[PDB]
């Protein structure tokens, strides 16, 4: 089995600065690491399929970094429409997920 | 007569669909294999393969090629096999194989009147055969050959040996210079891959290597450079240059035996049975050189060891050969 | 359906035996190369192994179509139906294009008629290795390719801004040698069967 | 394109429940079907997967013997089957499909189960 | 009259079919699902930096022009149908000389599921290239790659994917383990985008983690070099007056040391850097050369025993043990 | 009108020709007349027990369908007609890897005559199996054969008959000899009927008598063997005070005898019996090892040794009588 | 345009061209002018007795059917039309295995002159068999021939001649040989007669003088110096028994060792070569040098001092009767 650790549990920053998400795997997952957001009381959507490959429709401020073990999700400017917690999944094996990472705005 | 044969073959080949197997929507077709071992060329331990020359012969029954006018077995040309359905038999452990062409491509088609197609080929293969050599060269290899259908599953084709144990002939006349065929077996089995289940016939030989050829170049020098190491016990202790040059040469010679004999073998990690003999005889040669160093460390520093220790060398070395030639043989 | 009748209109009346502008002007061919890896340079045979992506670019007015489709990116089945220049490597000992699983050839035709043909080749080319100053040698290995039957008046060759783009240079098989420099030339050789246009690619190697 | 699931239900502990995921705009035979457990204020939890071309099924080791999936190509719908459900499994179930790089691009609206009195 | 029904179906598919065009040429991107069944991982030639692998290269895609209605669903067709239809031009990026086996028929099949799903497997032996870094010879480990992708179709036309999960999309058979020197540990796959002058292509890469087994080189290079040191250090136990006897020890050990120095690098490539075995040889060269200059020291100097021989009898066997304790500790871990 | 008369004839001939059917299939026997012109006899690979031969394989049969009337009695057609007409499926029974040369054009020939006689001459390079019996090495005389017959057609369909008078059919070229180890004595041909699994097949054969030359082996093996025995015999003529020096006689001459025993059985098959050279090696070791044994007896026992004085006479004549026996028993 | 006139011209020529018949089948024989532009003569081995040659083989014959009048150009078609047209049965008799190249297409050329001259050019890499009577090795001089003839056509149906008299063969000066030095080439016509008829043969010969220089720094100089190394033994005092005989027994074993170095650099030839005469002639001097010390010990100064100067005079005579004889 594969476990994904998302750090930190939560954070709180204002509108329009740099945020760096983290997701580290137990063993080698190559590129198949997915990023999902969860707006409260709606359905999850997909941000980045694979590592560092943007999905169609989401803005260009979302970007990712890929490696053998550690994967970072970066937004250049935090906006007012990003009130969701972000989940880091994997797909090199049978899929598993991290605990998610909430955020809040002032 | 010839025009009747001409109107028969053309009738058979008009409307013939090569892309459809016989009884495509019915029972699997029964294909019988007849292998005539012409020769086995090079059982090579370096590349872990053997070269096999055979007369492969398939035999199925096609109801479309059913002529019941001429009571003669209609042996056609070898250029008709690209217009008829043939099974897609491949060899799994095949490395490099070819069908001989001189003066034409060597293949056979013989249409029996009921519909039996005698499709036969002269195929020379190089079947990869991993050869475990833990007991080299007093070993017993087991080289196989897997006849297996590729594209047709169990519910589309089936394989069997035609003639039971008489399906493979001519293996008894095969005499390799180095090996000797002890037994051969014919196994019918079904293997399952992720795309389905496929029939498989395996022809497998048992090859027992020759001890005598090996002994002529690797054992008679091995039992005998140790004898030159035993000459040093008869030489007096004060003759230092005589015993040292005798003791160094028997050390360095057996080192050269191990080096030039092991590139013609693959770089296997375990100890083959001839390497246990060459390292065991190296210890006896090394202990003879250390026997003089014990003798010299006493006279100059601090004749009984030269008699007693000499007695022991043959006394044990012959016991070492008793252990060796009754365990590995 | 639209692409099928476009290709069925281009190939009807096409004569692959005749180069474009058979009596008008020489066909200007722009060549382009991408070296994947240079293999071991064997001194006993005076040869070196090279693996390239040999690409050619010319103009054929018969392969001209007016449609909304801009590029027709086709497979290797359309190579044998159109005219292909007879580029041969005149200093090559032995070489063969790769075939697995489907022969490694590319054919892209733009509306104008520009034909981009790219194939993967493994060439054993003859390189004279001066045995003097061994083993502190330095050589200039060439690679001369030209047309075979078409003279200077019928085929005129050319390169591109990046004539020869090398790859990573670290996954190469140059063990004792290190790649130093490249220079791309052109010349007109005169043989008994006319005058031919030779393009040479020189590789500078150090031991 | 559009993934549809049935509405929420109220069940007793120890009973059995049926939950469906209807797919529209695309057939099921060419893409996998993924089901995932979403507890409240917690992360996701994949429970099983379906290869509808051959009916192949592989579950999570935690949920072995807990859930069962049948799939009907004609009805264009995959079915849950929770045989031994307890009072602890009070959460929302989400539907998914295999994306371009084995991601889950398209998700259902989610059905929340409620095991209470 | 009972098999002409299936004759009508096969001619119905190929009527109007153009095999020069990929399916969905103006609509979508042709996903090619691929999985590799390795029947026998062949030998690794560490002189050519290459390896041989026998695969069952499966591919799968969807063509909407090959839909049919008939008695049976799966059409397990013959081999010659596959050349009449569109197939992707998958090639190996680091292949050197790969062979499709043709005995007796070509070793390809083609299954056409009635919805339009195609399965196209082939048996290939592939002589791919494995770049090696032999700085820890022979205790090294390698990641031999195998990269494949389309040739003429970019990432906007043909994309590749694995059929099953990427953990279990490359399967190695248990019986096929033709490595005699290396030891296969596991397989890891990945996928990315490469950049070229023509465009962007989708590449599928499967690495092969290999680890060399030391046991051949123990009984070929390591033990005879060790026993040469013991053969060279027995010269300290002789007398000072055995000048022709001790110079046989001082010459024949260093003459046989440089033969193993030459003969241990013959199977190796002509790499510029020094391998980890060569460091063991050079110290073993230094131990048998310092024994020769030890005898040349005592020969320069009623003859009592020497303090040099009484010290080199203890020091030289001890100092070789310190080196051997630290060499096997730092290169086996 | 000029050349099209020959076009009209050739188009008439293949109009209804079925190349899948032998001439006289259900009627009679297709007689095949066969010649072999050996242009060059290639080298014999003694390691693999095989040899190479370059032939001009001529086949002549009669086809009733290929009858014509025209302004030319014969027709020297090219090689493209060969695939369109029936040719017999002649293959070589003991061949290993053999090709037909196709540079620049196919090396084939067709001469259709007016009565229906055909001719089919091909240039081949046949690597054929030679069953070998090197027990009498290196005075071996191997009769390497070359057996060819039909593949699919039995004796009730296709029979073979030599064209010229027996041996006359096999005509060796005067300068065609690449035998660096052998020399061609003669060729003996015959005609058997081998009953295979699918019926009886008429098998043509041609045996090539070959004799080996020991001259090469002598310089490399036989002359360095005798000289190092004589080199060990030098030790008997020295004083016994020189123990160390006489040690170098017994050790190094045995060591190169070991080296010669390794080197002589190289590029030879690994047969499990012992060759006559291997018997000569073992006797030559017995004379060089007994010198080292006798030196240990002298050093165990100054004065000139009477054992060493008898060794200066007995040892040279014991090897001398063995060389008279071994070069008269085998060397016949 | 003009392209359609070129297209309809070639389609007129191939309409009814019978490849099976030679041009002017019922009349005089066709004459094929053949030239050879030699690009590189590759390695010439002796263990397999062959030489590898790549060249630009070119042929020329007049065909009256392929006569066009509308176009004044010397039309050069693609290489695929050569399979549609007649080609003579030119082959090489001494060829062992040959192949034409195939990158990027099949390396061949066919050109149609307006009168009918077919310029057929091929790029062929032959490996022709070269028998070598190396009785004079390594100071020998071979003659590697290349015999070019037809197969299916006799002298009544084809005639082979060189297009340029002593000039058709080119690039003969532009050839690299890592061992030989090419001195002479010779174009030869002939008419051989087999059983099936009389055939025309063109023979091309290459005389290859072997360079002494590789062998003079590898065999002769070690063999001469080891005779000098065995002659240091004459100047050692007779009391040093083990020291002197070790100088003699190491030289005679290394002289035996230098035998199989050359046994390796040579095939299994049954006669004695010139180098083997020299190598055995140096062996007997070393063997009698060790017998000289054995004669000294059997006597026990003047015996050794005679051979200290008699031996250089005898060995210099051996250089006279060998190194001046073969040169
Ligand atoms: C040529 C003639 C030679 C004659 C020699 C005669 C004498 C000796 C004769 C016989 C005795 C020895 C026989 C050895 C046989 C092979 C053993 C072997 O390979 O073991 C292991 C090597 O694993 C290692 O880790 C290698 C360790 C080498 C240590 C060497 C000794 C150093 C200390 C002492 C030296 C200094 C002492 C003095 C200091 C002053 C097996 O591991 P593997 O197979 O590589 O890998 C496992 C594979 N598997 C996972 C599939 C399981
Ligand atoms: C690899 C070693 C390199 C060493 C290089 C350096 C070598 C170096 O410096 O040698 C000088 C000396 C030689 O001593 P060694 O015992 O070999 O020689 C004795 C010494 O010369 C005495 O002085 C002599 O007695 P005397 O007074 O004449 O009556 C005696 O004669 P005898 O009693 O036989 O009649 C000689 O045998 O050694 C040291 O001082 C120890 C150095 C230890 C150095 C470390 C040694 C491990
Ligand atoms: C293959 C070897 C087989 C060996 C078999 C066993 C051979 C064997 O045992 O020989 C013993 C003897 C040795 O004779 P050799 O001359 O070598 O030894 C002398 C002998 O020991 C005298 O007795 C000594 O005199 P003494 O008593 O001190 O006064 C004399 O001393 P000195 O005078 O120097 O002071 C010694 O030199 O030889 C024979 O009798 C003839 C051998 C003929 C051998 C013919 C060929 C086989
Ligand atoms: C691999 O195996 C396949 C199948 O065994 C070989 O394909 C066969 O190739 C021959 C020669 O191209 C085909 O025959 C052709 O027939 C036409 C007439 O229909 C004729 O005009 C051609 O000149 C030629 O004779 C044959 O049909 C084809 N298929 C079969 C079923 O035999 C292929 O050549 C083999 N290749 C290798 C590299 O082994
Ligand atoms: C050489 O090795 C092969 C494979 O390792 C050996 O084949 C194995 O032989 C045994 C006994 O003949 C087979 O067992 C039998 O299998 C049949 C299958 O239907 C079964 O009906 C019998 O009851 C029995 O279990 C075994 O299957 C077979 N291996 C394989 C691959 O199936 C072979 O015997 C060895 N020796 C020789 C001389 O070839
Ligand atoms: C290399 O070997 C060949 C073949 O032995 C040598 O060719 C031979 O050359 C001589 C002339 O030096 C030819 O003799 C001449 O024949 C013509 C008729 O063809 C005649 O008119 C002349 O008066 C003269 O007799 C000889 O036939 C020819 N042999 C063959 C079989 O071609 C060649 O000279 C040798 N080396 C050189 C110098 O290239
Ligand atoms: C075609 O060949 C088969 C196989 O030889 C013939 O069938 C056998 O014929 C022999 C006699 O030639 C009989 O002894 C066997 O009993 C037959 N086997 C059977 C029928 O099972 C067959 O008769 C041949 N057909 C002909 C000659 O027209």
Coordinates of N, CA and C in Angstrom, one line a residue, chain E residues 135-190:
Chain E
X135 N 31.4 3.1 -11.7 CA 32.3 3.7 -10.7 C 32.3 2.8 -9.4
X136 N 31.4 1.9 -9.3 CA 31.3 0.9 -8.2 C 31.5 -0.5 -8.7
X137 N 32.3 -0.7 -9.7 CA 32.5 -2.1 -10.2 C 33.2 -2.9 -9.2
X138 N 32.8 -4.2 -9.0 CA 31.6 -4.8 -9.5 C 30.4 -4.8 -8.6
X139 N 30.5 -4.0 -7.6 CA 29.4 -3.9 -6.6 C 28.3 -2.9 -7.0
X140 N 28.2 -2.6 -8.2 CA 27.3 -1.5 -8.7 C 25.9 -2.0 -8.9
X141 N 25.0 -1.0 -9.1 CA 23.6 -1.3 -9.5 C 23.2 -0.3 -10.6
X142 N 22.4 -0.8 -11.5 CA 22.0 -0.1 -12.7 C 20.5 0.0 -12.9
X143 N 20.1 1.1 -13.6 CA 18.7 1.3 -13.9 C 18.7 1.3 -15.5
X144 N 18.6 0.1 -16.1 CA 18.5 0.0 -17.5 C 17.2 0.5 -18.0
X145 N 17.1 1.4 -18.9 CA 15.8 1.9 -19.3 C 15.2 1.2 -20.6
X146 N 14.0 1.5 -20.9 CA 13.4 1.1 -22.2 C 12.3 2.1 -22.5
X147 N 12.7 3.1 -23.4 CA 11.8 4.2 -23.8 C 11.2 3.9 -25.1
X148 N 9.9 4.0 -25.2 CA 9.2 3.9 -26.5 C 8.1 4.9 -26.7
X149 N 7.8 5.2 -27.9 CA 6.7 6.2 -28.2 C 6.5 6.2 -29.7
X150 N 5.5 7.0 -30.1 CA 5.2 7.1 -31.5 C 6.4 7.9 -32.3
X151 N 6.4 7.7 -33.6 CA 7.4 8.4 -34.4 C 6.9 9.5 -35.2
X152 N 5.8 9.3 -36.0 CA 5.3 10.4 -36.9 C 4.1 11.1 -36.3
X153 N 3.6 10.7 -35.1 CA 2.4 11.3 -34.5 C 2.8 12.0 -33.2
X154 N 2.4 13.3 -33.2 CA 2.8 14.1 -32.0 C 1.8 13.9 -30.9
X155 N 2.0 14.6 -29.8 CA 1.1 14.5 -28.6 C -0.3 15.0 -28.8
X156 N -0.5 15.8 -29.9 CA -1.9 16.2 -30.3 C -2.6 15.2 -31.1
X157 N -1.9 14.1 -31.5 CA -2.5 13.1 -32.4 C -2.6 11.8 -31.7
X158 N -1.5 11.3 -31.2 CA -1.5 9.9 -30.5 C -0.8 10.1 -29.1
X159 N -1.6 9.7 -28.1 CA -1.0 9.6 -26.7 C -1.0 8.2 -26.3
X160 N -0.1 7.9 -25.4 CA 0.1 6.5 -24.9 C -0.4 6.4 -23.4
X161 N -0.8 5.2 -23.0 CA -1.2 5.0 -21.6 C -1.0 3.5 -21.3
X162 N -1.0 3.2 -20.1 CA -0.9 1.8 -19.6 C -2.3 1.2 -19.5
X163 N -2.5 -0.1 -19.8 CA -3.8 -0.7 -19.7 C -4.2 -0.9 -18.3
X164 N -3.5 -1.7 -17.6 CA -3.7 -1.9 -16.1 C -3.0 -0.8 -15.3
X165 N -2.9 -1.0 -14.0 CA -2.2 0.0 -13.2 C -0.7 0.0 -13.5
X166 N -0.1 1.2 -13.4 CA 1.3 1.2 -13.8 C 2.3 0.4 -12.9
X167 N 1.8 0.0 -11.7 CA 2.6 -0.9 -10.9 C 2.7 -2.3 -11.5
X168 N 1.6 -2.7 -12.1 CA 1.5 -4.1 -12.7 C 1.1 -4.0 -14.1
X169 N 1.7 -3.1 -14.9 CA 1.6 -3.0 -16.3 C 2.8 -3.6 -17.1
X170 N 3.9 -3.8 -16.4 CA 5.0 -4.6 -16.9 C 5.2 -5.8 -16.1
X171 N 5.0 -7.0 -16.6 CA 5.0 -8.2 -15.9 C 6.2 -9.1 -16.4
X172 N 7.0 -9.5 -15.5 CA 8.1 -10.4 -15.8 C 7.8 -11.8 -15.5
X173 N 8.0 -12.7 -16.4 CA 7.7 -14.1 -16.2 C 8.7 -14.7 -15.2
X174 N 8.3 -15.7 -14.4 CA 9.1 -16.3 -13.4 C 10.2 -17.2 -14.0
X175 N 9.8 -17.9 -15.1 CA 10.8 -18.8 -15.7 C 11.8 -18.1 -16.5
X176 N 11.5 -17.0 -17.1 CA 12.5 -16.2 -17.9 C 13.4 -15.3 -17.1
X177 N 14.6 -15.8 -16.7 CA 15.5 -15.1 -15.9 C 16.9 -15.3 -16.5
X178 N 17.1 -15.0 -17.8 CA 18.3 -15.3 -18.5 C 19.5 -14.5 -18.1
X179 N 19.4 -13.6 -17.1 CA 20.6 -13.0 -16.5 C 21.4 -14.0 -15.8
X180 N 22.7 -14.1 -16.2 CA 23.7 -14.9 -15.5 C 24.6 -14.2 -14.6
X181 N 24.8 -12.9 -14.8 CA 25.7 -12.1 -14.0 C 24.9 -11.1 -13.1
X182 N 23.9 -10.5 -13.7 CA 23.1 -9.5 -12.9 C 22.0 -10.2 -12.2
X183 N 21.2 -9.4 -11.4 CA 20.1 -9.9 -10.7 C 18.9 -8.9 -10.7
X184 N 17.8 -9.3 -11.3 CA 16.7 -8.3 -11.5 C 16.0 -8.1 -10.2
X185 N 15.8 -6.9 -9.8 CA 15.2 -6.5 -8.6 C 13.7 -6.1 -8.7
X186 N 13.4 -5.3 -9.7 CA 12.1 -4.8 -9.9 C 12.0 -3.9 -11.2
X187 N 10.8 -3.6 -11.5 CA 10.6 -2.7 -12.7 C 9.8 -1.5 -12.3
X188 N 10.1 -0.3 -12.8 CA 9.4 0.9 -12.6 C 9.2 1.6 -13.9
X189 N 7.9 2.1 -14.0 CA 7.5 2.8 -15.3 C 7.3 4.3 -15.0
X190 N 7.2 5.0 -16.1 CA 7.0 6.5 -16.1 C 6.6 6.9 -17.4

